[PDB]
Amino acid sequence: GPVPFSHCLPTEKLQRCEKIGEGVFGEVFQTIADHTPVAIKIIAIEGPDLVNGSHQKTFEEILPEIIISKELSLLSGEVCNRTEGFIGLNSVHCVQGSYPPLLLKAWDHYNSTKGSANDRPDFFKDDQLFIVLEFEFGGIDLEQMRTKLSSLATAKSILHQLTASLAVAEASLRFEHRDLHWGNVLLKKTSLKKLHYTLNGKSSTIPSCGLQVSIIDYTLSRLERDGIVVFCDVSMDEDLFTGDGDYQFDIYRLMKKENNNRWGEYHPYSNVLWLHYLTDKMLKQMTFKTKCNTPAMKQIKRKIQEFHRTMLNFSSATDLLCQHSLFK
Ligand SMILES: Cn1cc(-c2cc[n+]3[nH]cc(-c4ccncc4)c3n2)cn1
Ligand code: NA
Numbered sequence: 564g565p566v567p568f569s570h571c572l573p574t575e576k577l578q579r580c581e582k583i584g585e586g587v588f589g590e591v592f593q594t595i596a597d598h599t600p601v602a603i604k605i606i607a608i609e610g611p612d613l614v615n616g617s618h619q620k621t622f623e624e625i626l627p628e629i630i631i632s633k634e635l636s637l638l639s640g641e642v643c644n645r646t647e648g649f650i651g652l653n654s655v656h657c658v659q660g661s662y663p664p665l666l667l668k669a670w671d672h673y674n675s676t677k678g679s680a681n682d683r684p685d686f687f688k689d690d691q692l693f694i695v696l697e698f699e700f701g702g703i704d705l706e707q708m709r710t711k712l713s714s715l716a717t718a719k720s721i722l723h724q725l726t727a728s729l730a731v732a733e734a735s736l737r738f739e740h741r742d743l744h745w746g747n748v749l750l751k752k753t754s755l756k757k758l759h760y761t762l763n764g765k766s767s768t769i770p771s772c773g774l775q776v777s778i779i780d781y782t783l784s785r786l787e788r789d790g791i792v793v794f795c796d797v798s799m800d801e802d803l804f805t806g807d808g809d810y811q812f813d814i815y816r817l818m819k820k821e822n823n824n825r826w827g828e829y830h831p832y833s834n835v836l837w838l839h840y841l842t843d844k845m846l847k848q849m850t851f852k853t854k855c856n857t858p859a860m861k862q863i864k865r866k867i868q869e870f871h872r873t874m875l876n877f878s879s880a881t882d883l884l885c886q887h888s889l890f891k
């Protein structure tokens with residue numbers, strides 16, 4: 564059966580919780596477990612109340628995301644297709660109870676300082692079920708780092724890292740992220756100068772520029788193993804395809820166009836579209852501590868602009884990694 568919140572969040576862990584993120588799905592908190600930073604994602608399930616504009620998923624409907632989180636976490640310890648470019652999954656629990664007052668206080672603090680699009684999660688009864696996923700702490704998201712990156716050399720490293728991670732997941736799992744907006748790209752400092760990945764048994768390296776990227780949030784993602792497909796069926800979703808004011812919202816429509824609204828199929832082109840969306844953000848909505856006013860930095864900008872304008876002619880992240888000139 565389910566465990567109480569206190570199993571996952573004993574008092575000391577609970578008192579160090581700070582809200583760091585949110586979505587229609589629920590809430591993300593940061594805390595410390597055994598002297599180690601973690602991130603906790605809490606999703607309400609199985610109940611009849613509306614949560615953040617939507618009906619709650621059933622256990623069956625949340626299982627895809629659990630499976631996908633597990634598979635992507637394992638890629639860090641694999642050999643033939645290996646990347647640390649996702650996020651570690653430490654545990655998954657099914658929790659029963661009302662929302663802890665200390666989490667509501669952290670929610671309130673986030674609402675006061677950043678503002679929330681979500682309902683205050685104070686209406687859940689003591690029989691409410693939740694899934695609680697505990698993840699490795701992956702750093703700070705790219706959006707919050709819009710004005711903090713050193714140079715376009717960093718931006719290139721980020722793009723390489725993302726492309727390689729997606730390619731390794733494509734090769735191993737026929738993976739599509741399907742929601743890789745710039746809130747879902749985390750950055751963390753590293754003293755490694757070179758990061759390593761392996762794609763179908765060929766190892767290669769990427770200059771880090773002092774950051775390691777983690778891709779997060781598999782709410783909409785898709786993959787398969789041994790012909791069994793795991794995915795979020797959004798074919799009957801209205802609102803996902805009606806957004807505007809950001810190219811992000813076009814991607815959802817271009818994905819639907821690419822896949823003819825058949826979300827079970829494999830269309831790794833969706834990874835290319837998200838990469839294009841991300842390249843666009845780097846070229847337009849970000850600013851660097853060091854400008855591009857040296858010849859060496861200028862050539863990097865030209866290469867990323869060239870990537871922006873040619874990448875949509877590639878069929879997958881694998882195709883980009885193996886064949887685009889940006890990564891030679
Ligand atoms: C939706 N989702 C978020 C996570 C996750 C996993 C690990 N970390 N580590 C840091 C963050 C985070 C999330 C947001 N805004 C800033 C940081 C973080 N988030 C996993 N799924
Ligand atoms: Na990672």
Ligand code: NI
Pocket residue numbers: 570656
């Ligand atoms: Ni446990």
